[PDB]
Design a binder for this molecule. Structure first.
Ligand SMILES: [Cl-]
Ligand SMILES: [Cl-]
Ligand SMILES: [Cl-]
Ligand code: NA
Ligand code: NA
Lengths: 133, 158, 166, 133
């Protein structure tokens, strides 16, 4: 899977995700990536793009949940994204990237790694593969 | 106030046993696209435009599972899917079951923009692509030999 | 004490002046299927089994836009979709792009339980149906006059319309 | 679109939705019915089946929002169902049916009518088309 989430200084959010899916998937099998709410979601509050085992992301509606947690329970982007990845989804099945309306970046994952990169107008940028340490 | 961007080229089990020849072109892939998206935000392109543009490029990198370099079905075929969403409008677009379409995400944008629907799939998504004159290649061109061997291995592994 | 059940046959723009021919069969449909759901719960079938049972019956009401009586594409063809979800296990199953499967909901189930996937669509999902041996019918058997007539009106107006449209 | 939701004495919840979709849809068009979290969802807390203008159900992730408003903001089934239907969807585009773990039943809709039925073990029944008004 590949994805990007972006936000300007006025909090206009967006998400885009794209994949070839799962190696050896049955012909006709659809995953999370094209399901608004699972693989891809973007709001007033935030934007999200997930990746990993499609079936676990569909089931946990992870892109919507991060937004829903923020709005409905008041959690920050980091708390919400962490809850979905490290609580309501199985180890080794899913990673996500997100940005908030205010510019916040979260990139949790419960897999061994996730090819990732991020940056801000204020100057920050990492690229990574495995968890930071 | 300031822009921010995040991007990925896949999550999963990435080994400590990871060779450079597969590590570096993914690290270069990620760096190249970060710069493409950052330069877009600096020039203050709309976020929606920016995520299509960055995802388009992430697709064009043969080392990630999307666009050229997509993984294979049990029949050794390419079936690609994408989705795009604007949070300021709630507008959405999605495609599935694409095989000859170079930048699926750009086709997902077109459904959003040119169609009254959010989601088209398989033969009908491919029809829409054709009306729209988007870049199609034929499907050999999307199949890396990394993914062919990947598939064979997964089949006997089950 | 225990069980509740609900069901529907579509939401849309339904005039108060829905003619007898259009109204009685839908009202009858609702009753027939509700009796079946209630009896199944009374006999304590698992709720997941009950919803598949009731939707198979709703699918079989020619006056409801699912299965037999599905609305038509711009090409005058049939493309049915369905999903099912067990709330106790989070298991789910879905299908799309069926043209000959008599009871789509039951293929959604089959995908759930017999496939490491949740969602199958179009040719691949007809392939699964064939493999699993579910009932398939000539596409024509799914088509109703009422639906052909709606397409016609929608097709000259250049609109995408809900079955229940003025 | 057709659908049915049911719950037993133990809270075991389930949901099913089926459709031909929209009249005159482009070939290949996918609606809310096959998407989890959009047209169909079921949970510890509730089960939902939605109906109407597919795209408008995908956009608002209807079936999942309901469950999510309940768990995360504490809304009852009734309040959550009314909120998604009457405050987050354009009028004349969406109805839904839902039941909760504890037996509650909610059948709101913002269309002119929705063909619907429901019953409980205690003895309630109802067939209906238009709003009670
Ligand atoms: Cl996938
Ligand atoms: Cl629909
Ligand atoms: Cl009534
Ligand atoms: Na690629
Ligand atoms: Na029917």
């Amino acid at each position: 899977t590949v994805g990007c989430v972006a936000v300007d200084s006025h909090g206009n959010l967006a998400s885009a995700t794209s994949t070839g899916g799962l190696v050896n998937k049955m012909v006709g099998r659809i995953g999370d990536t094209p399901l608004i709410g699972a693989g891809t979601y973007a709001n007033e509050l935030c934007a999200v793009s997930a990746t990993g085992k499609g079936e676990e992301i569909i089931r946990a509606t992870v892109a919507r949940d991060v937004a829903a947690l923020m709005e409905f329970k008041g959690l920050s982007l980091k708390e919400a994204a962490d809850f979905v990845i490290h609580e309501r989804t199985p180890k080794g099945t899913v990673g996500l990237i997100a940005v908030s309306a205010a510019g916040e970046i979260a990139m949790p994952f419960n897999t061994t790694g996730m090819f990732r990169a991020c940056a801000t107008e204020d100057g920050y940028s990492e690229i990574a593969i495995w968890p930071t340490t | 106030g300031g822009w921010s961007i995040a991007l990925h080229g896949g999550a999963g089990d990435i080994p400590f046993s990871l060779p450079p020849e597969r590590r570096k072109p993914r690290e270069e892939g990620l760096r190249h696209c970060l710069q493409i998206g950052v330069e877009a935000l600096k020039a203050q392109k709309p976020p929606l435009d920016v995520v299509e543009l960055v995802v388009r490029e992430l697709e064009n990198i043969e080392h990630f599972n999307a666009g050229i370099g997509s993984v294979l079905t049990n029949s050794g075929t390419v079936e690609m899917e994408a989705s795009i969403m604007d949070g300021n409008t709630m507008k959405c677009g999605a495609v599935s079951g694409l095989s000859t379409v170079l930048n699926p995400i750009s086709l997902a944008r077109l459904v959003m923009d040119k169609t009254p629907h959010i989601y088209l799939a398989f033969q009908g998504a491919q029809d829409f692509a054709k009306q729209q004159g988007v870049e199609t290649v034929d499907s050999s061109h999307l199949i890396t030999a990394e993914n062919v061997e990947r598939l064979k291995l997964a089949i006997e592994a089950n």
